[model samples]
Target: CSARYNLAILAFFGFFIVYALRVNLSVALVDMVDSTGKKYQWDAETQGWILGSFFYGYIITQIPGGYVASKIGGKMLLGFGILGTAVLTLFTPIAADLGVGPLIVLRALEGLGEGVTFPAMHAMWSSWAPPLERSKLLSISYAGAQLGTVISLPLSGIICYYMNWTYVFYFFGTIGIFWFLLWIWLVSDTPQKHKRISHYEKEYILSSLRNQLSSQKSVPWVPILKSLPLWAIVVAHFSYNWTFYTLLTLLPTYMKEILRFNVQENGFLSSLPYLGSWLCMILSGQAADNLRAKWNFSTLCVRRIFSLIGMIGPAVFLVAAGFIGCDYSLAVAFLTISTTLGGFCSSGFSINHLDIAPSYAGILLGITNTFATIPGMVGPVIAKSLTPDNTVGEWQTVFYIAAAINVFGAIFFTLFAKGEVQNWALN
Candidate 1:
């Protein structure tokens, strides 16, 4: 393959690995916590914290990770981040073996290590992908998140059943190491520097991205904050993340515990929604790109319509699922439809950073992502806390929270967000 394709695939797989580690924990949680006694059995509230704690570490490192990626370049940051995650993932089982507190600590450390990935990977795309094709490239890469969900559910489910929860982390951690090796070899700081890129391809990619990459001005925090277009993107990001993460983090348990699937059946079935999402994301990107070309639409229209479709459609299904989710087949249908919406929403949000400010896409993304991660931090705890009694009704309560947040997200983006390029550098 050509260098761009090679690098893009590496980044794609890198994110896939990151998310597999992040999302797999919830599936394993059913096994990870000790549940020997009726009185002592772990409740959804505590499970939510254990699942959400990783984002506490993840959110803390965002601005710093952006700065680090800007200074040293994404390749080195990704290399180190992956390595740290690999080692930690390898030992997460050790912490689980010790106790829940140790497991939380390990998850946090793993989050800290994994923190650099978004900035690094997004920055790499900013450098490598051309403007016309940038959305497509990023959507393809971001789909890896869905793929991670798909892979983690079945793989972790089976492993947790046959072996133990720790092996899920160990298995994924080993995959991270392999990803690091290919990443270090394949990724280049810029198009010109890549030894493998043909001259024609290099020129084509650079011309498309130069305006975004040149970034002549110093990082402009104030203007970015003030820009309506920028705010639109930020609002949309927070909204999308608030809703989608709930699905990624909690839905697996929702499948196994609330829906009451057996270990063998649940693990494999849990992966299905993500599988639908993976397909939807790839299709969504192509759809968006085609819309961009055919309708002569602004970035705003493309982004808004897709997100609205993705968010609202799923919310409606999920609410219905809350009622009929007991029948395993019907429940799986609802989950698949809802998660497919989430997957498409993610690709739409993923492309907005590039659309709004190709020049400072990374920093703009970091700022918006800063706001976005708050939900990533709080949503799980809210779901768990609201459902303190851990009844089937509690899980429905959690779905209500997800539906409300997603409806709010759909409205927020429909009313406020746009995907137009900003005028910062021209000033």
Candidate 2:
């Protein structure tokens, strides 16, 4: 592969490992419970806290991480941040042995490490992806996140069943450490910095970024904060993530507790939604590029259409899944459809930061993701609170809230999201 595509490949692995570390605990925590009724079993609220703790530290480092990635280079930040997460995963079992308090603290620290990933990748890609190829390349890389959840959920289940829950950490952690080695060897911050890139490829990437490069050190926070399009992007991100985090953190538990599935079945079934999502994400990326290229649609129109599909489709399916009641097959099918349609956002608001301001992509992602991270903390807590009895009616309420948020976000984005570069970014 060429150097540019190689970077995308590395980014794929980076996100894969990042998400694996972030979510392995969700599945493993199932086996961690003392189901024999002898030792202490954590209540729903406590599990919520443990799951939510990561986002607390995740939120702390985003803006600074973006600044650092923009100023220095994303290579070091992305590499080391994930490396820290791998190391921290090794110690997670120790923390859990200590107590939920210790586990939450460690998980938060792990989140602090991973907080750099999205911003760093955005900054790196700003200097790498050509405008036309951006959607396909980024979608390929970001799809690793869905695949990560897909693999981790099932693999963690198997490990927990066959060996022990602790091995789940050990397994993914070791892979993450190895991934860092590959990243350091292969990836660079920009095309100009890559040792092995061809002359033509280097020229191509650098030329695309000509209008975006700036010597200005100051970020226009006031302007960025005031921009309606940007806030529309933020709301879209926050809304999408609310549903995502809900499924990521609690889907396995739902399958096991409510659907009455075994650990193995829980793992496999829980992965179906992400599998569908990954498939749809790849297809959506190709479709989006075609729409913008061959059909010659406006970028705004393309983003809005996909965003509406992603937002509204998932909402409808989620509500359907909730109301499906005890029909496990139908519920699973609806949930899978929900995430599959939601995958179009990869080509929508997810990459719209680059659409409006390639130069500010990193910081924009940091700002928006900071808000998006709130749902990570809030989704599980809300699920636990609403589903005190884990009934269909209770879970239906949770799904309705998520669907409502998606609907509102889609409507607002349709009204305000822009495809053109902003004046402040040029300034």
Candidate 3:
């Protein structure tokens, strides 16, 4: 039995559960409020605040998580992170009934749990992935995040319709726990600890892991803290996420108000962009891997060009979607196109953490992602202020601002972001 195959699937499901834990609220909040005046009355701005609160805890935990993962191992880091978040998810409906402020506090606590997951993920790959096989497995595993969104949105809608809004949280939160146990049961520190792995497969993984032994050397923090290329990624992370968190948080309401879709319809229609995004993410990884092998493109060339596609391409189409006024179908089509191209970003700045600091990907990612988490905290309140009356013109303004941010991020990355291994990374 190959431990590698098992670990990849577990990794895939872990993010699925992660996103499912994170996003169930986005979909359920619509029904929670629109359908739940029976409980409490939350204004538009208050809802934005509730939506934004999760990322504050998300930011606070980043560096501490990587340290713990480094100390105790990714297995415990990922398991407890997801497990604690899952426990928080179960309390969500109870917290909502208690008060908006309490729910916000609970969500922040949940974010504290989930922020460790990515750090745990990045730490393990160097130990497990064969050099040439890295991106392929990563694609399969991460695409589950989009699938989680796609499934959770529609299923949440249906659950709210058939059962109750509270059940959406129960359903996903319940499923989330099952995985926590699975991760603990199936995952180990490395192939070294797996009693059942084939000896040759274990040896093959170890051979490629020669440099991993060097990771015990302390980091070169001085030049890294000053690096321009790293800042380019930091800026890109913030820019991309501003639009992402805004749209994801607001999409159900936008669908109901703008497109006039029923809740079930809103759920299914809202899932479309992520469906396109998931497919594009998987295919772009394959395309990028092929270019690296056969086309002989320099690594910097791949990084910049794919970054351009994922960044500028979405910005342009997002701006266009604003102009397609009454044709809801065409509007949705453009929105999906915009998100699909963003899949190219999986090959872009997402992996640049590994490129610049192969040994330090987890640390650098914690840095950039902490910056990225800010937009999720701020984007919704800003988007709400822009769309005061929910008119198409109001919506258009929100789209333009997000597009401008995305466009500028691409130009900055193209100009400054690098693909070379940094001297500071090794020394």
Candidate 4:
């Protein structure tokens, strides 16, 4: 009956599929890189490069991907992104057999496809989401991100145990194809284009989005490039990813190395942080929307408050987690607490690209995410360098560095982030 709400749920599934494709490797590689049976003889540094290689093509593709999504419609961009990544996912096992170079190249290509996904999802939401309901709707869609992570890490491990590691790639890649077909069948680029939309629902959506012209005009690249508000998002995005990517690429190693967990245990325990993230993201979205609608806070105030909570609070906990040493229970608690706090960011800068410029939301996210992904490339590598001995102190220093970046990112965003639509964005 409610067309827009259906779109929201479908988008959530779309995110779920893409995230499964993205995070499965993180878990699979625990077995892929090392084993008592036989494994690819990848050193720690080699593994860092393998993990980090995904971001190389990912970083390069963002702007162009966002730009193309704007012109062609988000449907094709999002669909093709996932579809291509799916194709590459099927190749992952063979590429590994070919050698480290081929595997890295294969992962980079997969990243190339996935790079468009975040921005393309933004593009889809720009036309679908009404302003007052943005936080909740966006939250519903993005919470799929953590849900995928929560499920995939454990599921990937189960496959590794019950089946062969190669099945992990085969499994997720096949799921991606099914989701792509479903996505193409159901979702439309805009309300006007949706063949099955109810007339009354369409009117409500369009009227609510009236202030948003949903421009077809050329991108105001100069204003967008120079804008302080955009830069604030850039800083926040980068800082958030520094810790997130570091933990994601290395947490299994952390569990196995410092905490002394086996593969099954690492898979299950690693999921805890994202499980916390999934719940917190859902709760925070409800809170963010309620803050704006029920409590009558300005969008700016709601944004600042939630964003600060996400950043500074997580920074504090990340620092505390570092100090917890080899006490696995305490370390798990702090790490989970830190990522849970990070879920507030789902309502924060994560969607601010839509707030400032619905027309260019995809492009803005691409620009910022391009910068944000840099930490992904460098962070795990940096951690590899920092933790040569696998000592808790070295790991603690890693957390300290991340905490500083998180706090400073909060500072910059507080000073400069905007919630009002930029003037240049108006038609």
lDDT of each: 0.75, 0.83, 0.81, 0.82
Question: Model 1, range 101-121, lDDT digits (tens) per residue?
Answer: 886788788788888887877
Q: Give the TM-score of candidate 4.
A: 0.87
Q: Flag regions of model 2 displaced more than 4 Å.
A: 35-40, 126-137, 185-224, 293-298, 421-427
The TM-scores of all predictions, comma-separated, are 0.87, 0.88, 0.92, 0.87
State which candidate has the highest TM-score: 3
**Local error of candidate 3 at residue 253 (angstroms):** 1.7
Clashing pairs in 1: none
Taking the tens digit of each residue's C-alpha lDDT, what string does model 3 give over 176-207?
89998888887887889876788889998887
Top-lDDT candidate index: 2
Candidate 2: how large is its RMSD?
Answer: 3.1
lDDT of 2 by residue, 1-427 (tens): 8887888989998898999998898887766765421234787677888887888879888788887887888899999999999998998887887888888999899999999897788778877988778867887788777678788888888887778877888888899999999999989887888888899988877777674454544455535357888898998999899999988888887887677788887888888788888888778877887888887667888899999999999999999998886677989899889988977986666878888876576567777889988999898888877786677787888889989998998998888888887677775
User: Which of 2 and 3 is ahead in lDDT?
Assistant: 2
Question: If ranked by lDDT, best first, what sequence of candidates would result?
Answer: 2, 4, 3, 1
What is the alpha-carbon lDDT for the whole of candidate 4?
0.82
Query: Candidate 2, TM-score vs. the true structure?
Result: 0.88
Give the CA lDDT, 0 to 100, for residue 3 in model 3: 81
The deviation in Å at residue 339 for candidate 2 is 1.3
RMSD of 1: 3.4
For residues 1-427, what per-residue lDDT tens digits would candidate 4 score against the true structure?
3777787787787778778887788887877776333478776778788888888879989888877877787888988998999989988888888898998898899889988887787777777888778767876787776687788889887887777778988999888888888888998889999989989888888988886555355545545367889899899999999988988888887887778777787888899888988788778877777777778566787777788999988899989988987997998899899988987986666768778776666557667888999998999888877876678898898889999999999888878978777677765
